[PDB]
Amino acid sequence: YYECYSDVSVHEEMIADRVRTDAYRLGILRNWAALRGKTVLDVGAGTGILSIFCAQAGARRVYAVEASAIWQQAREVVRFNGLEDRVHVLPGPVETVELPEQVDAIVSEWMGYGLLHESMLSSVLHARTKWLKEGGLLLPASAELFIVPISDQMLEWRLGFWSQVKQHYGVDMSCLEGFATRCLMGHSEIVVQGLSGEDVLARPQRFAQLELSRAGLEQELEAGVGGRFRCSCYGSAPMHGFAIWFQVTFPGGESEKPLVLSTSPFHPATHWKQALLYLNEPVQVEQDTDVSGEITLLPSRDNPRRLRVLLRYKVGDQEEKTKDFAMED
Amino acid sequence: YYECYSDVSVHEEMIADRVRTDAYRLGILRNWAALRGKTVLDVGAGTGILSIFCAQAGARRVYAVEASAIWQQAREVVRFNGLEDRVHVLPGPVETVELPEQVDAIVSEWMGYGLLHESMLSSVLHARTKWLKEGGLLLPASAELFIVPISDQMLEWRLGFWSQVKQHYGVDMSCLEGFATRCLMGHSEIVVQGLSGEDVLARPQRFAQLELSRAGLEQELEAGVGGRFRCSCYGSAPMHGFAIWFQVTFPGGESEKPLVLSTSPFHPATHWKQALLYLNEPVQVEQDTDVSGEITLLPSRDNPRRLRVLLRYKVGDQEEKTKDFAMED
Ligand SMILES: Nc1ncnc2c1ncn2[C@@H]1O[C@H](CSCC[C@H](N)C(=O)O)[C@@H](O)[C@H]1O
Numbered sequence: 001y002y003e004c005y006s007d008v009s010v011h012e013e014m015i016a017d018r019v020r021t022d023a024y025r026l027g028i029l030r031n032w033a034a035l036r037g038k039t040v041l042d043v044g045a046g047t048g049i050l051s052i053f054c055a056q057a058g059a060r061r062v063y064a065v066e067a068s069a070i071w072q073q074a075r076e077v078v079r080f081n082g083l084e085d086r087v088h089v090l091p092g093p094v095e096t097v098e099l100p101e102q103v104d105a106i107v108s109e110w111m112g113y114g115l116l117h118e119s120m121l122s123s124v125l126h127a128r129t130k131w132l133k134e135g136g137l138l139l140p141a142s143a144e145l146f147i148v149p150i151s152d153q154m155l156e157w158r159l160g161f162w163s164q165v166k167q168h169y170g171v172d173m174s175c176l177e178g179f180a181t182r183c184l185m186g187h188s189e190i191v192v193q194g195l196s197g198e199d200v201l202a203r204p205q206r207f208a209q210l211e212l213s214r215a216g217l218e219q220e221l222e223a224g225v226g227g228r229f230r231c232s233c234y235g236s237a238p239m240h241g242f243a244i245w246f247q248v249t250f251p252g253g254e255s256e257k258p259l260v261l262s263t264s265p266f267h268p269a270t271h272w273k274q275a276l277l278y279l280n281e282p283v284q285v286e287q288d289t290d291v292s293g294e295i296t297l298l299p300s301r302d303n304p305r306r307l308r309v310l311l312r313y314k315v316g317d318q319e320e321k322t323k324d325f326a327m328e329d
Numbered sequence: 330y331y332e333c334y335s336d337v338s339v340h341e342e343m344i345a346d347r348v349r350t351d352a353y354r355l356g357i358l359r360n361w362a363a364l365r366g367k368t369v370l371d372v373g374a375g376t377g378i379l380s381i382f383c384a385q386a387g388a389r390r391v392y393a394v395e396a397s398a399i400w401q402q403a404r405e406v407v408r409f410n411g412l413e414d415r416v417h418v419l420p421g422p423v424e425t426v427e428l429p430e431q432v433d434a435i436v437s438e439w440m441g442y443g444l445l446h447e448s449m450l451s452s453v454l455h456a457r458t459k460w461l462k463e464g465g466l467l468l469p470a471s472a473e474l475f476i477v478p479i480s481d482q483m484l485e486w487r488l489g490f491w492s493q494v495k496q497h498y499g500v501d502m503s504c505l506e507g508f509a510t511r512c513l514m515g516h517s518e519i520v521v522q523g524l525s526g527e528d529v530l531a532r533p534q535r536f537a538q539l540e541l542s543r544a545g546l547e548q549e550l551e552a553g554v555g556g557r558f559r560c561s562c563y564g565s566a567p568m569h570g571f572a573i574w575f576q577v578t579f580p581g582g583e584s585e586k587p588l589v590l591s592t593s594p595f596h597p598a599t600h601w602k603q604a605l606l607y608l609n610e611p612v613q614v615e616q617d618t619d620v621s622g623e624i625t626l627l628p629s630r631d632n633p634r635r636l637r638v639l640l641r642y643k644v645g646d647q648e649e650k651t652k653d654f655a656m657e658d
């Protein structure tokens with residue numbers, strides 16, 4: 001109650017993100033054969049919506065675990081839809097909650113900005129080991145990370161602003177373009193922004209793959225997830241940096257059609273958008289200009305739930321360069 | 330340079346606010362007779378744009394005073410437009426800067442959200458006493474504050490969201506409307522948001538008037554500016570609270586046409602928008618429902634540059650009520 005408008009905004013945003021909500025729904029319904037008459041743990045159930053989807057798919061019992069005070073509204077929604085015999089809202093953190101039994105499946109909305117910024121992944125991996133039966137079902141089951149060079153159209157418009165002041169005002173401010181450019185690009189902060197698809201300058205490259213079933217994924221993550229990438233640009237453009245984004249994949253079930261929830265700018269927009277990594281200044285690329293490097297996602301020294309990115313990159317004939325970024329948390 | 334994208338964003342926003350920028354421009358040009366061959370002090374000159382407008386209007390000398398490091402770009406713009414003989418950029422705070430002389434006029438973009446949140450008014454009043462000649466020109470010369478009851482259409486859409494979840498998802502969340510309503514309205518925070526004109530439920534009432542020429546305005550402000558108001562509603566609606574906004578007025582000059590820069594939702598949008606004061610829950614009003622009360626704007630106990638609002642109000646047959654608000658700074 002004390003400042004509970006944040007809780008309302010989080011879940012309004014989450015439910016209003018139809019692509020996300022429908023991805024989980026269809027992901028769940030497609031695993032009807034694995035879920036029918038079986039038991040499910042919803043890690044961080046929020047308003048309870050995903051737990052109710054599991055009931056819709058035929059789960060006998062769903063344990064909706066929620067740490068925030070939103071759990072009371074989740075309970076109200078469950079009973080308001082007459083599912084209190086099949087869905088049980090359990091308040092508290094998932095790492096300390098007491099279930100009456102192990103489960104056949106886990107469902108969880110755990111992904112953060114850039115996948116791993118302030119995410120619930122460790123809670124999910126903790127709850128897998130503790131509560132999910134051996135060979136059990138994970139929804140989603142995997143995650144993939146992508147990187148690509150971009151020309152951010154919005155930034156270009158912001159930088160070109162100063163050279164147009166003269167038109168209506170008779171004061172020329174073209175001289176500030178360099179200052180503007182160096183300020184909006186020279187910072188070391190990951191910018192969360194929605195790109196349009198035509199801002200993408202090459203075929204997106206996958207640099208990491210997270211199999212959530214693997215034991216000791218938790219340890220590998222602490223060392224940092226990332227890898228090398230290479231691509232070639234489509235045509236002439238001012239490159240301002242890179243975008244990273246993710247997808248998660250739900251198992252196929254009986255129909256054997258795995259469902260992908262993507263946050264790519266080629267797929268419908270989500271609240272996650274994309275995470276943008278700006279170079280210190282623009283770089284002109286050409287058709288077939290080769291762009292390569294290495295990217296690692298890491299926990300920040302200060303707060304390890306905050307996302308840090310080490311980028312090593314090389315654009316065409318330019319020397320190899322590096323830049324450290326972090327999310328503003 | 331260290332995190333100078335904030336400086337770029339402030340001034341991009343400020344210049345891109347065409348209504349504001351053109352108001353100052355025309356306000357200045359209309360006082361050509363008072364400014365021609367005379368001297369001007371631009372309090373907080375930023376990119377220098379207003380100082381250059383004063384040159385355009387015929388000022389012999391303009392002293393552009395700027396505390397932030399943006400002063401270097403202001404200097405660059407002045408020389409890039411060939412005005413370094415008439416406009417002199419002086420770095421530092423206006424309260425400690427050293428001018429070679431008193432001035433015939435002051436121009437200043439000083440207004441904050443809700444007029445007085447983190448505003449430069451005291452700097453302006455300080456610089457008036459210290460540097461402006463007796464009887465000198467103030468641009469703008471006055472400010473006025475308005476209040477009106479509103480039905481916030483955006484909030485209504487946010488509150489109605491939960492009752493529509495069922496349509497596409499088959500999970501009914503109408504039960505959360507009360508929780509949503511109490512959370513988004515029960516807080517004590519001034520919300521800065523742009524309203525549409527049809528959200529206004531009555532004739533706006535002016536509750537305060539600031540004559541910037543008056544000595545001891547600085548002392549009166551510390552006691553708090555405000556006053557009583559009374560109005561009657563136009564028709565049936567769910568009232569969610571009040572909006573406050575301001576205008577500033579430039580002297581008329583030879584044409585005797587004073588220019589008003591308004592932040593009302595009946596005039597074109599500005600970056601200031603309006604400051605919204607929400608009731609703890611909606612109240613239904615009717616045609617001719619009488620809404621009255623008292624509003625005071627104050628410095629907050631913690632930070633006095635942060636805006637606090639005491640509201641006392643009465644809607645129709647309902648009892649008299651009170652609510653304290655503050656801007657999230
Ligand atoms: N360790 C933990 N244990 C239980 N809940 C957690 C948690 N960490 C985060 N959460 C909760 O998990 C939710 C993430 S948002 C997901 C909400 C809902 N499942 C949906 O898909 O719409 C939040 O409500 C947050 O409070």
Ligand SMILES: Nc1ncnc2c1ncn2[C@@H]1O[C@H](CSCC[C@H](N)C(=O)O)[C@@H](O)[C@H]1O
Nearest residue numbers: 343373374375394395396397422423438452
């Ligand atoms: N005490 C003070 N002395 C000098 N400048 C100040 C000040 N307080 C705030 N400022 C500056 O005043 C500016 C307000 S924004 C106005 C910018 C410009 N005059 C325009 O109209 O577009 C900012 O650049 C801020 O850095």
